[PDB]
């Protein structure tokens, strides 16, 4: 889960195992991200932790603002590029994996997200539904 | 399904959906903006020397000089010729929003396409003047 995620999140596919390199979506200056652990994971021998859309992970800027590295910050996925199943049945998917940086309560670091954002992620976190312009 | 098609047209290896390309070619200010393109450092040519019909960053002046005179770029030049297959093509070819289809194709056949072709002409002349 994570704190600040309003309401319960059903299960969607797991597109971003640990080691994935997604994009940074907001205008915080970070250019891309790296996932080092996904919060709320399970616990199973050999099962790589994996991240879905709307999840909150622990990312590190692999390349970006020269003044942001060496630290690890909570990130929130907003695109996935692995066909997940919407409920009113249609398997949809995106063009690439991308997330936004937020302080652990859920509040945006940057100011505006560029690109479409998952409807499920925007529904779950109410601070993406405020700093997003294109809800899927 | 085998290897070529998948390890080429994978979601990590996309082109730029030539409806976007044609949109970017219709309007003169977009032509000039994507043509000047203040220097960046990741893209291979570092900004300049970039084909606007395709979506590729040719490395150098000579590289683009030859790229324009080829069968790939000519293939895409002819690919970008007519109405670029909006969703409304596929939704009016089934008896739905046929009026929106007609208005759009009317605009293209009468108002937008002339400026598009005129601008690809002017862009060719500019590519020459630089090259």
């Amino acid at each position: 889960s994570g704190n600040g995620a309003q309401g319960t999140k059903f299960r969607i596919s797991l597109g971003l195992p640990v080691g994935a390199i997604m994009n940074c979506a907001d205008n915080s200056g970070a250019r891309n991200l790296y996932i080092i652990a996904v919060k709320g994971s399970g616990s199973r021998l050999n099962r790589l932790p994996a991240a879905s859309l709307g999840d909150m992970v622990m990312a590190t800027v692999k390349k970006g603002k020269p003044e942001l590295r060496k630290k690890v910050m909570p990130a929130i996925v907003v695109r996935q590029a692995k066909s997940w199943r919407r409920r009113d049945g249609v398997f949809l998917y995106f063009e690439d994996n991308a997330g936004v940086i937020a302080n652990p309560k859920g509040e945006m670091k940057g100011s505006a997200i560029t690109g479409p954002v998952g409807k499920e992620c925007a529904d779950l976190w109410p601070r993406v539904a405020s700093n997003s312009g294109v809800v899927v | 399904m085998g290897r070529y098609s998948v390890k080429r047209y994978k979601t990590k290896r996309r082109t730029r959906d030539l409806d976007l390309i044609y949109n970017d070619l219709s309007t003169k200010e977009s032509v000039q903006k994507l043509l000047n393109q203040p220097l960046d450092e990741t893209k291979p040519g570092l900004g300049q020397h970039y084909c606007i019909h395709c979506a590729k960053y040719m490395e150098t002046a000579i590289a683009l000089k030859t790229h324009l005179k080829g069968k790939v770029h000519k293939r895409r030049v002819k690919e970008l010729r007519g109405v670029p297959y909006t969703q409304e093509v596929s939704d009016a070819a089934a008896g739905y929003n046929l009026n929106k289809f007609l208005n759009r194709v009317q605009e293209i056949t009468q108002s937008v396409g002339p400026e598009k072709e005129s601008n690809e002409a002017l862009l060719k002349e500019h590519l020459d003047s630089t090259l």
Partner: protein, 96 residues
């Protein structure tokens, strides 16, 4: 020596032995118990499984995320023509 890392057992031991059934008609082993004041009513019914299809239903599931929203999901279709009675059988309870 003990075990280094722990993982649950692979499989379920309640379902053993994993052997072919005794028949195709799997048998009912327990019946809704009884009540000798309800009107007589059957407790079981046997039919034939025929395929599986899809459905979209509107959800009235208060307090749920999909309240007043549509939901698509699968259904099985079992083909159950009328069943017809041919005998009765009575069972007495013995200390065996």
């Amino acid at each position: 020596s003990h075990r280094k890392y722990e993982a649950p057992r692979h499989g379920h031991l309640g379902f053993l032995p994993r052997k072919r059934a005794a028949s195709i008609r799997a048998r009912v082993k327990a019946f809704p118990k009884d009540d000798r004041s309800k009107p007589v009513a059957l407790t079981s019914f046997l039919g034939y499984k025929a395929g599986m299809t899809t459905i979209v239903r509107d959800l009235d599931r208060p307090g749920s995320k999909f309240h007043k929203r549509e939901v698509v999901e699968a259904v099985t279709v079992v083909d159950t023509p009328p069943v017809v009675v041919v005998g009765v059988v009575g069972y007495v309870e013995t200390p065996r």
